[PDB]
Structure formats: structure tokens, C-alpha cells
Design a protein around this ligand. Structure first.
Ligand SMILES: CC(C)CN(C[C@@H](O)[C@H](Cc1ccccc1)NC(=O)O[C@H]1CCOC1)S(=O)(=O)c1ccc(N)cc1
Ligand SMILES: [Cl-]
Lengths: 99, 99
């Protein structure tokens, strides 16, 4: 699908059995999802941006269905205002920025 | 061009006669650049990032060249980790997300 940017590029995703809305973000290195429970071991990490840093839990090898496309990779779970799909998963679904 | 996301989508921008590096950021509503001197009066603006809200200076009708493409629009100046080209200017250069 070809997504224009007149508005936030939001899509529906499936993770850990729940349905959520997330932003397709080329500016985000890794994917970050709001507080939720995920299975497995995790390790703490700090990610920073506009406003500073937040502490997140790094879960590896998580499966996510992005707009009907399955993908595997690291997911950061923490107090983010919005669910963000980063480059680590955008690449897996073959997303590109065109102009 | 067609930009894959295996690495940060960085591009050269030309603003105020200077060459700078900037990130094509679909998850950013506005364009935010590091401290520098811009012409005209500014208005105050509050923007929200991953770590909270910050105060920036808004300059309108600034001429900016993004990867060789000329745009003219709003540019915010403040304490940002990297120069960010947000949706306000991406729409001007006709950028889309495809997959
Ligand atoms: C600042 C860039 C370099 C990185 N951020 C991505 C950006 O797309 C970020 C996404 C976002 C949108 C709305 C609320 C909160 C975050 N937009 C952003 O700050 O929008 C501001 C600037 C203009 O409009 C509002 S990040 O969230 O800090 C980040 C850092 C590390 C990881 N692993 C993932 C995400
Ligand atoms: Cl590829």
C-alpha cells in the first residue's frame, strides 16, 4: 500500500495476542510499545529522543503482524506516548521511503 | 529515489546557506532543527517527544533544500538530538511510505 503523509501513518498491529494501533516511523531505530506483558526474559535499556530518555525492557525475537505482514525482531516495552514501529521491523516487511 | 531502512534515512539539507545532515522521520509531525540563527520573528511552540514535552522556537516560511528538493515551510528550532525532517516537509517533497 502507498501511504501519504498528510496524516500520521497509523496502522493496526497484532502483538502478544492483542490488537494495537502503531506509527510507521522511519525515524525510530527500534520498535517501542506501550506497557504490556510479553513472554520471556528481557533486559533494561534506555532510549532517548525529544524530551530526553525513558527506561524500557528489551524483548528479543518477538513476532508481530504489521498491517497483515508477519515479522520477527526486538521490541522495546515501556512508557511511550505512542506505539512505534521502528526500522528493525519496517525493513522486514519491505517498507521504503519514496519521493 | 527509493530509500530502504536498513540504516538511518539520513540526507543532506541546505538551510540558511549551510549544509546539514537530517533524518527523514515519518513519525515526526513537524521539522525540528538544532540551534542556529534564522531570519524573522518566532512564535513559541510546545512539542511532545518520547521523553516528554519541550519548548521550541517556530519560524515560518523558511526555505529549505531537502536532498536537492526545494521546500518552504515551518521549521522549529530547539534541543533536538538530530535534525529531523517531519511530515510537514515530507508532504512537500512528495514522500510516501510503500510496502
Ligand atoms: C527523535 C528521533 C531521532 C527518534 N524518535 C522517533 C520520532 O519519530 C518520534 C516518534 C514519536 C511521536 C510522538 C510521540 C513520541 C514519539 N517523533 C517525535 O519526537 O516527534 C516530535 C518531533 C516533531 O513532531 C513531534 S524517538 O521516539 O525518540 C525513538 C528513539 C529510539 C527508538 N528506539 C525509538 C523511537
Ligand atoms: Cl530490501
Amino acid at each position: 500500500p502507498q501511504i501519504t503523509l498528510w496524516k500520521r501513518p497509523l496502522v493496526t498491529i497484532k502483538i502478544g495476542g492483542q490488537l494495537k494501533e502503531a506509527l510507521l516511523d522511519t525515524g525510530a531505530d527500534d520498535t517501542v510499545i506501550e506497557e504490556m506483558s510479553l513472554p520471556g526474559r528481557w533486559k533494561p535499556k534506555m532510549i532517548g529522543g525529544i524530551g530526553g530518555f525513558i527506561k524500557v525492557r528489551q524483548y528479543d525475537q518477538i513476532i508481530i503482524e504489521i498491517a497483515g505482514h508477519k515479522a520477527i525482531g526486538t521490541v522495546l516495552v515501556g512508557p511511550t506516548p505512542v506505539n512505534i514501529i521502528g526500522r528493525n521491523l519496517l525493513t522486514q516487511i519491505g517498507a521504503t521511503l519514496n519521493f
